[PDB]
């Protein structure tokens, strides 16, 4: 499934990501846009031999177990299949764990490059 700006925004506010550990909804909409283009089934393979899965392209060497990254740390303690669903539940709970580390949303390259220091509320302005 591919999401819309306002659609993703609403769903992420229903999943309590607005101001989770201080990060406003716009930050998450922006990050998701530049990480997967609102694609729930986006997959990207890396140099490690890992895969990035889902709306927020969560890595399989650190956060999920696919059975295809050996030595994964599975920090979100989840299968990577759950990050490829049309339901954003698992992606959200995992991103909440990722952001609850001291690095924060600096674990998402897109966010660092395209959202940090910008008016991210622009990504929710227009949505009701």
């Amino acid at each position, epitope marked *: 499934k591919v999401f819309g700006r306002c659609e993703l925004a609403a769903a992420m*506010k*229903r*999943h*309590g*990501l*607005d*101001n*989770y*550990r*201080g990060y406003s909804l716009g930050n998450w909409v922006c990050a998701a846009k530049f990480e997967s283009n609102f694609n729930t089934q986006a997959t990207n393979r890396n140099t490690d031999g890992s895969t990035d899965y889902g709306i927020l392209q969560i890595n399989s060497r*650190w956060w999920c177990n696919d059975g295809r990254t050996p030595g994964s*740390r*599975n*920090l979100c*303690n989840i299968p990577c299949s759950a990050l490829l669903s049309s339901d954003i*539940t698992a992606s959200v*709970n995992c991103a*909440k*764990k990722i952001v*609850s*580390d*001291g*690095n924060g949303m600096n674990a998402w390259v897109a966010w660092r490059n395209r959202c940090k220091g910008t008016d991210v509320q622009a990504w929710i302005r227009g949505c009701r």
Partner: antibody, heavy 113, light 108 residues
Framework: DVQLQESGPSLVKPSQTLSLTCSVT????????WSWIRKFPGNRLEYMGY???????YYNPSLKSRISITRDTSKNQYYLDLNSVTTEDTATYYC???????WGQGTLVTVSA | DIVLTQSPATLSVTPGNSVSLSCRAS??????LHWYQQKSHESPRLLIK???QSISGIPSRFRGRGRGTRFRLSINSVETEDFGMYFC?????????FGGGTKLEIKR
């Protein structure tokens, strides 16, 4: 699967330092975030702190000046240090993962002279 | 520092009836409220995560409802094995805070 065990003194003297140990079997401590929680005699639970993957440690502001959470990958363990303990710090201490689904059995610590 | 107040503090129920437990927050916490059960001789047991999500194995008679500043745990057709303390916890802000508890007593 992970099994958690708290270990430490049952009697600590006031003004001294409390030390606890959470031993983890089943999975590495590099597979989760690990935390310390205590339950006071009045059935009041307090989240003491947690350590993340980068080594960032988050401490309750109330105890920030007296608490230190450390790790040992060599022994698959993490440790709690609470300084300047008082009689009000008598409680049952639990180590647990940040997910909150794997808990230890609890270790009772009485702070008394 | 979010303050969580739980109500009522103690409730007695005849097995077969439904109960609702309330957890109120001092500030909006979205859906980041978790419910735990602690019985005698036992470490806290996660029952509900992010305030409506189920946990594998936990009876479907447990229900989570709420978003924002007021949340609730419902136990429909309460059974005998549901005696214990019930705690709510937030995870939206640090420090992570708990509620005071609700002791459930089973009438017999």
């Amino acid at each position: 699967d992970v099994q958690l065990q708290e270990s430490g003194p049952s009697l600590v003297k006031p003004s001294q330092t409390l030390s606890l140990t959470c031993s983890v079997t089943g999975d590495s401590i590099t597979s989760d975030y690990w935390s310390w929680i205590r339950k006071f005699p009045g059935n009041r639970l307090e989240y003491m702190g947690y350590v993340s993957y980068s080594g960032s440690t988050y401490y309750n502001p109330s105890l920030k000046s007296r608490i230190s959470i450390t790790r040992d990958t060599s022994k698959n363990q993490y440790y709690l240090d609470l300084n300047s303990v008082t009689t009000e710090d008598t409680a049952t201490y639990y180590c647990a993962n940040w997910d909150g689904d794997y808990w230890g059995q609890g270790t009772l610590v009485t702070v008394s002279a | 520092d979010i303050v969580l107040t739980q109500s009522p503090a103690t409730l007695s129920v005849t097995p077969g009836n439904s109960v609702s437990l309330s957890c109120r927050a001092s500030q909006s916490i979205g859906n980041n409220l978790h419910w735990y059960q602690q019985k005698s001789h036992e470490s806290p047991r996660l029952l509900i995560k992010y305030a409506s999500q189920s946990i594998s194995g936990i009876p479907s008679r447990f229900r989570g409802r709420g978003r924002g500043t007021r949340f609730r745990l419902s136990i429909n057709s309460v059974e005998t094995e549901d005696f214990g303390m019930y705690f709510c916890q937030q995870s939206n802000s640090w420090p992570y805070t708990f509620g005071g508890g609700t002791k459930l007593e089973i009438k017999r």
